[PDB]
Amino acid sequence: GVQVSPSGEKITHTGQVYDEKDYRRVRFVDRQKEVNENFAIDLIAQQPVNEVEHRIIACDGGGGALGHPKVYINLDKETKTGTCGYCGLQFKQH
Amino acid sequence: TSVKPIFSRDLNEAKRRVRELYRAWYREVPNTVHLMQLDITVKQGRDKVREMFMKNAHVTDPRVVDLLVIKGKMELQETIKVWKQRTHVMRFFHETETPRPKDFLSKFYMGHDP
Amino acid sequence: GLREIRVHLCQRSPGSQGVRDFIVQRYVELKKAHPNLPILIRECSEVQPKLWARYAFGQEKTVSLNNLSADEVTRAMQNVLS
Amino acid sequence: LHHAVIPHGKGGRSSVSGVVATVFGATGFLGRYVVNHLGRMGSQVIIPYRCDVYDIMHLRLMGDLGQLTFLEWDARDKDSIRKAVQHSNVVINLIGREWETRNFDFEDVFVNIPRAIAQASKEAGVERFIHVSHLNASMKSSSKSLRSKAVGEKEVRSVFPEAIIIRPSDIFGREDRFLNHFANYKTVKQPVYVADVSKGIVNATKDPDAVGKTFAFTGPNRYLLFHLVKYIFGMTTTKDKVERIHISDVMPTDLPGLEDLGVQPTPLELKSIEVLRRHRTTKPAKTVNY
Amino acid sequence: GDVGAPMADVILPGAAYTEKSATYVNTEGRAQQTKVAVTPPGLAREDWKIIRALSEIAGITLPYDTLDQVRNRLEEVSPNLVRYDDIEETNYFQQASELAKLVNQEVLADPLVPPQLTIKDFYMTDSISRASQTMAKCVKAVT
Amino acid sequence: QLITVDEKLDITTLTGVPEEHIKTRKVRIFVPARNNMQSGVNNTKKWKMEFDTRERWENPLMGWASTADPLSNMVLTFSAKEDAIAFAEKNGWSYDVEEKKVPKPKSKSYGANFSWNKRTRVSTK
Amino acid sequence: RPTVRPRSDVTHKQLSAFGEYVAEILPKYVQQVQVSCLDELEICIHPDGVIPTLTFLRDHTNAQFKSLADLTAVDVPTRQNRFEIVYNLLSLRFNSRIRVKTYADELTPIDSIVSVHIAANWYEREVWDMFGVFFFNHPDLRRILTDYGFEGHPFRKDFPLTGYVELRYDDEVKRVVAEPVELAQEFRKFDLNSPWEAFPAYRQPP
Ligand SMILES: NC(=O)C1=CN([C@@H]2O[C@H](COP(=O)(O)OP(=O)(O)OC[C@H]3O[C@@H](n4cnc5c(N)ncnc54)[C@H](OP(=O)(O)O)[C@@H]3O)[C@@H](O)[C@H]2O)C=CC1
Ligand SMILES: [Zn+2]
Fold it and tell me: Which parts pass through the membrane (chain D)?
């Protein structure tokens, strides 16, 4: 979530802030700093872990198309979860 | 080695073509500052012509000289016929830019200009 | 006030035969005589041998040794050192 | 130093010059050149305005994309000057009227507003302040304008000791109130060109041997008012204006001049032709010294 | 700025090897040259330009204005530093040893250990390897 | 109808290129090294001429990469070092030249991985 | 096949025969006749055969190559004669097309053919303006596509894409001044060519 810096500037989803001593803060004077308040890194964490009875699981994101390329993930390592490099979802072996 | 020529056999004929071109320019110059209301003086214009001529003095090849004559004639046409403008003619003096200082130190101090 | 000597020479060329002869004949003696002097032997390919000698406050001289014999090279060396 | 200031580039429109300048008085006649000289080398330029947005459109094209920042203000409104002086290294003041309105007297213009500007600059933490005045600035003056100018210079120095005062003489260019004022229809003048003045100021904006000093920017030559007005008429209403007209130009002694910033005088005998051809439908003037 | 910069009186920033054309030489006499990839950061400059300008200021104006002139100076001082990629044979070890045989100095008892024993020390041997926050990961992982 | 002009060739005054970019420069003639990522050699077959790199700084507005050298993306392709150097001379550029680093012929023997006496014996097939 | 292009040999035959025809009529001014896979006929010649060959092809009864579809130049800076010159010609009596090529360089001009085809009056000016190649016996030869004070030939391979100068309005002098080029986003040079050979038929020998 956007949390403000000493100077009074909102931080972005990639930690960008004009140093308090920076002259580039002028462009915001009498204006605003466009920032997105929905952080994917948190919205995906809010999602739960899927469970499957198979040690290998295919992910596409939803619709066959409208999703992403079908990728296959392994679930032999009960220590952690199996994450998709496209959608961020994570699965377990039960 | 041996070549095929262009509009000349030797640098003497080439230079006399050049001198004819200089006659033409030198003579026409003031009509330009008259037609198009340039600020500069005819002395400045003529010094500029001399500078732009001596800029290509080391040249030796009759062909490389005939081509420069051709291009100068093209420019003189564009100028006597009012196709160029105040802008195109004043694009010779560079009134809106400082030159790269010809000093190792004046270069070093600001940038990597070698 | 000499501060440095540096011989630049070649190999497999006539111009440097006298200089190679000088190096084999009188270089160890010169070093042991004046050991604290920097003598820079520098050989390359397709050069004309020279002897750049550098004095105190940023000056130096040179002499072509091309087509010279060992005795003449020693003559020039002693001339410089003197 | 902050990496956002390191002057990277080659001295061009799309370069960086490390000059962050808040300029008051850009909607006028000398700012129109100061801002160009600042921006055509890659400087950041804050411009406060009180005019309507139409009268500030001749300045959007003289600087690269994103270097110009136009905001609004009001001299009587403080906290509209912090906005503009903050985020800057240099402040330039060019304000000044040739007459008095209802709300704004010479006192206000030349004493009270510059003082607050310099106060806010010092508060913010900027490192250079440049103020422009008249060559004949003096308390002993038929015109009260010059009185106020010579008072405001001290009122500034009392808050910004390391400031930089610049006293040019009657300035001549296009859209100037001197040659056009004469051609609308005992005293020697040495006028000067906006190009020279702006070059001087923009050079002082970086030059390190200019702080806590003064400069008398005067032309190369001098002329008798009569010879000059006759030259005008050959090439072709305010009491205080006429008073400033009927005063000769001082020859300031050993004061750091124009050629000390690097600039060179451009004689009026070369730009009069371009300034005056508009007022149409010759030999030069004999330069003299008293 | 790692060790010698804090204990300094004046500091002149310069350019690394990814930011200058410059000759280096390996253990076999093979002269090689870098090629500028990224101009230096900010006010940093090239070292030979810095020293040249310094001399010009002092009053000792050097004769080197360009890299080709500096390379011709390198040629005069030692003519091998411009034959890039090429090694040059040498044939005077007999004299070298003839002389070196007259140098009395006795060895000592302590063994001759190498300072780099474990890979833990291969990393972090120069200022760049101390600045790298990846070499630190590698050291930490090793230990 | 033929003339003899044996002097060196130059077209610098016709190219229209300026002095700053015709004398203050340094050109490089080489064969682009093979990308060790790939094993293809269809890129080490034509010589290439490029220039020295110059300042490439950051725009304050957006952070983009700004320049003033208009010959930073100029790369020319040739089939022969002689032609490359002739072109360089013709135009008036001070050039450095590199040689074609060809790999050596190698002796490969699949049988060497199973010897009875040598060290080339491999421990994993 | 449905994804490949058909292939008729009658045209290859006709054009090879006409190549032999043209070449044995003009053994002089001729070299490198070639008809390609896609059935197009190129004839390379010497710069001294331009008008002879064009006139022959236009007027000869068997040829009647009247229309000058196009005139072009091409810059290959790895060959001593770097400026290839191309005339694309059309005949309506036979529904046929042909290509006539020659070569040139700097300082080595070509002969104009406005006497033969008057369309060239502008194509040759365009070539001179873009590639820097003079033509003999051209009434007017001058900048046609470029600005009036432009110094350069920009369709070469050594002229930079973005150029050497740049324009903008400056209030001081009240004009459109020129200056060096300073971009806010340097054009990016994408290196795309692949390391793996795609066509063996064109594999050069080492
Ligand atoms: N030319 C001369 O004869 C000489 C002039 N000078 C100095 O030159 C400077 C500028 O000259 P010039 O360019 O002719 O000035 P201009 O009148 O051309 O414009 C000056 C600026 O002052 C601003 N200004 C004036 N009064 C007020 C006010 N009461 N409140 C807010 N803003 C105000 C105006 O902003 P807006 O337009 O938005 O109202 C205007 O843009 C002056 O400061 C003068 O002292 C010094 C010596 C000689
Ligand atoms: Zn997925």
Answer: none
H or E segment to which residue B113 belongs: none
Q: How many residues does chain B have?
A: 114
Asked if the Cβ–Cβ distance from B67 to G107 is below 8 Å, we say yes
> DSSP 3-state helix, strand, coil percentages of chain G (rounded to 5)?
20, 25, 55
Task: Tell me how crowded residue E5 is: count the other CB atoms within 10 A of its CB.
Answer: 10
Spatial distance between the Cα atoms of B6 and B62, rounded to a whole number of angstroms: 7
Cβ proximity of D217 and D190 under 8 Å: no
**Resolution in angstrom units:** 3.2
- Residue B30's φ and ψ, nearest 5 degrees, are -60, -35
Q: Give the whole-angstrom CA distance, residue D255 versus residue B74.
A: 53
Q: How many residues does chain F have?
A: 125
Compute, in degrees rounded to 10, the torsion defined by CA atoms E31, E36, E40, E45: 60
Q: Which of D24, D29, D58 to mutate to test the pocket of ligand 1 (most atoms within 8 A of CB)?
A: D29
**Residues D47 and D26: beta-carbon distance below 8 Å:** yes
Element spanning C54, H or E: strand C50-54
| CA–CA separation, G136 and B44 (whole Å) | 35
- Count other C-beta atoms under 10 Å from residue D24's C-beta: 24
- Token pair, residue C66, equals 């091309």
| Residue extents of the structural domains in chain C | 1-82
3-state secondary structure chain D: CCCCCCCCCCCCCCCCCCCEEEEECCCCCCHHHHHHHHHCCCCEEEEEECCCHHHHCCCCCCCCCCCEEEEECECCECCCCHHHHCCCCEEEECCCCCCCCCCCCHHHHHHHHHHHHHHHHHHHCCCEEEEECCCCCCCCCCCHHHHHHHHHHHHHHCCCCCCEEEEECCEECCCCCCHHHHHCCCCEECCEEHHHHHHHHHHHCCCCCCCCEEEEECCCCCEEHHHHHHHHHHHCCCHHHHHHHCCCCCCCCCCCCCCCCCCCCCCHHHHHHHHHHHHCCCCCCCCCCC
Measure the CA–CA gap between G103 and G110, rounded to whole angstroms: 9
D11 inside 8 A of chain B by CB? yes
For E51-75, b where at least 16 C-beta lie within 10 A, e where not — what string? ebbeeeeeeeebebeebeebbeeeb
C-alpha span between D219 and E114 (Å, rounded): 76
Contact residues for E25 (Cβ-Cβ < 8 A; gap 6+): E31, E32, E81
Q: DSSP label at G139? A: S
Specify the 3-state DSSP secondary structure of E56. helix
Partners of D24 in beta bridges: D93
| Beta-carbon separation of D9 and F58 below 8 A | no
Are residues G89 and G57 in contact, defined by beta-carbon separation less than 8 angstroms? yes
What residue numbers bound the domain in which B84 lies?
1-114
Inter-residue contact G85 to G57 (CB < 8 Å): no
Closest residue in G to F62 (Cα–Cα): G184
Q: Which protein residue has the closest C-alpha to ligand 1 atom 3? A: D170
Q: How far is E131 from chain D (nearest CA, A)?
A: 20
Q: How far is it, in rounded angstroms, from Cα E34 to Cα E51?
A: 20
> What whole-number distance in Å separates Cα of residue D141 and Cα of residue A75?
93
CB within 8 Å of chain E, chain C residues 2-61: 6, 8, 11, 23-24, 27-28, 31-32, 40-45, 47, 52, 58
End-to-end CA distance of chain D: 50
DSSP E strand boundaries for G76-160:
83-91, 96-104, 110-111, 135-136
Pairing, β F47-51 against β F27-30: antiparallel
Query: What are C24's two structure tokens?
Result: 């084999």
Are residues A7 and A29 in contact, defined by beta-carbon separation less than 8 angstroms? no
| Technique of determination | cryo-EM
Report d(CA B38, CA D233) in Å as an integer: 21
CB-defined site of ligand 1, < 6 Å = D 25, 27-30, 49-51, 75, 94-97, 104, 109, 132-134, 168, 170-171
Q: Is residue F18 exposed (0-12), middle (13-18) or buried (19+ Cβ within 10 Å)?
A: middle
